[PDB]
Amino acid sequence: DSVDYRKKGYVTPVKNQGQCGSCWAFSSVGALEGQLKKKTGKLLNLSPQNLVDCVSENDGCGGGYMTNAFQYVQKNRGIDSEDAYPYVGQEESCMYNPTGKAAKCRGYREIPEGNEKALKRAVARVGPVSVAIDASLTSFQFYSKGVYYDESCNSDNLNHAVLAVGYGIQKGNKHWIIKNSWGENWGNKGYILMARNKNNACGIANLASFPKM
Ligand SMILES: *C(=O)[C@H](CCCC)NC(=O)O[C@H](Cc1ccccc1)C(C)C
């Protein structure tokens, strides 16, 4: 059992945060995009800028939480599209666009903390799932290929949000198919395969969630 939403057209191209710590915004957007495709058949970029500028509970370019983002989209009656609310790599005034909403959100669900099997079930039944991991390691920052696994990764040190678009096995190594938001020059075309069922490496399942659409 393995799934690759990229193969089903549930994933938009890899984005680049620019000089802004908006990992969580891209992560949330990637998740909503997946549900939008599943629900309507259309694959299009949602606005991470809309979240950066508007999610009051977060710190824009200084960090944030996907859950808060999903809550905002629901309470806000929607999120605009990238075309209607362009990414600028820096936090600005929350702008309202009457004809900008491209997607909706009915709330969200969290994956039971540390449960990698629950994470697998969610990814399979829902679609791409937002997750938080410890990305402070040089090995991760400079990851190139294969299945990433470092014994120094700290599951108690979540500092980066990415998107789980699937999971599988490579050369007998189970893994999570992760979409990053540091451009296509990072990792393998912007993607990284992270160890799966390897004792919850990097805390991949400590802060996972997806939106209800
Ligand atoms: C991902 O780009 C951001 C970068 C912030 C560091 C400049 N990391 C992040 O949002 O982590 C959040 C928790 C957090 C960390 C620091 C400040 C505020 C919030 C979770 C997604 C781990």
Q: Closest Cα to residue 50, out of 94, 20, 16, 15?
A: 94
Residues linked to residue 195 through DSSP beta bridges, in sequence order: 175
- Amino acid identity, residue 191? Y
- In eight-state DSSP terms, residue 183 is -
Q: What method did the depositors use to determine the structure? A: X-ray
160 assigned to active site: yes
Distances in whole angstroms, Cα of residue 34 to Cα of each of 104, 125, 140, 167:
12, 12, 25, 15
- Tell me the two tokens of residue 155: 């599951």
- Annotation marks residue 23 as catalytic: yes
Region of residue 142 (left: phi > 0; alpha: psi -120 to 50; beta: else):
alpha
83 C-alpha to ligand 1 centroid (Å): 25
Catalytic residue (choose from 160, 175, 200, 206):
160
Report the number of distinct structural domains present in the chain: 1
Assigned token pair, 54:
């508007």
Token pair in block for residue 142: 């400079």
CA–CA separation, 140 vs 6, rounded Å?
Answer: 22
Chain center to CA of 149: 19
Which two structure tokens, joined as six digits, stand for 107? Answer: 């709330």
Owning domain of residue 96: 1-213
Any idea what the CATH number is for the domain that residue 171 is in? 3.90.70.10
Q: Is the CB of 21 under 6 A from ligand 1?
A: yes
Record the resolution, in angstroms: 2.4
Chain center to CA of 136: 17
Residue 62 region, left (φ>0) first, then alpha (ψ -120 to 50), else beta? alpha
Residue 117, SS3 per DSSP: helix
3-state class (DSSP) for residue 57? coil
CA distance 99 to 102: 9
- Closest-CA residue, ligand 1 atom 22, reads 159
The dihedral through the CA atoms of 139, 140, 143, 147 has a sign that is: positive
Distance CA 20, CA 147 (A): 27
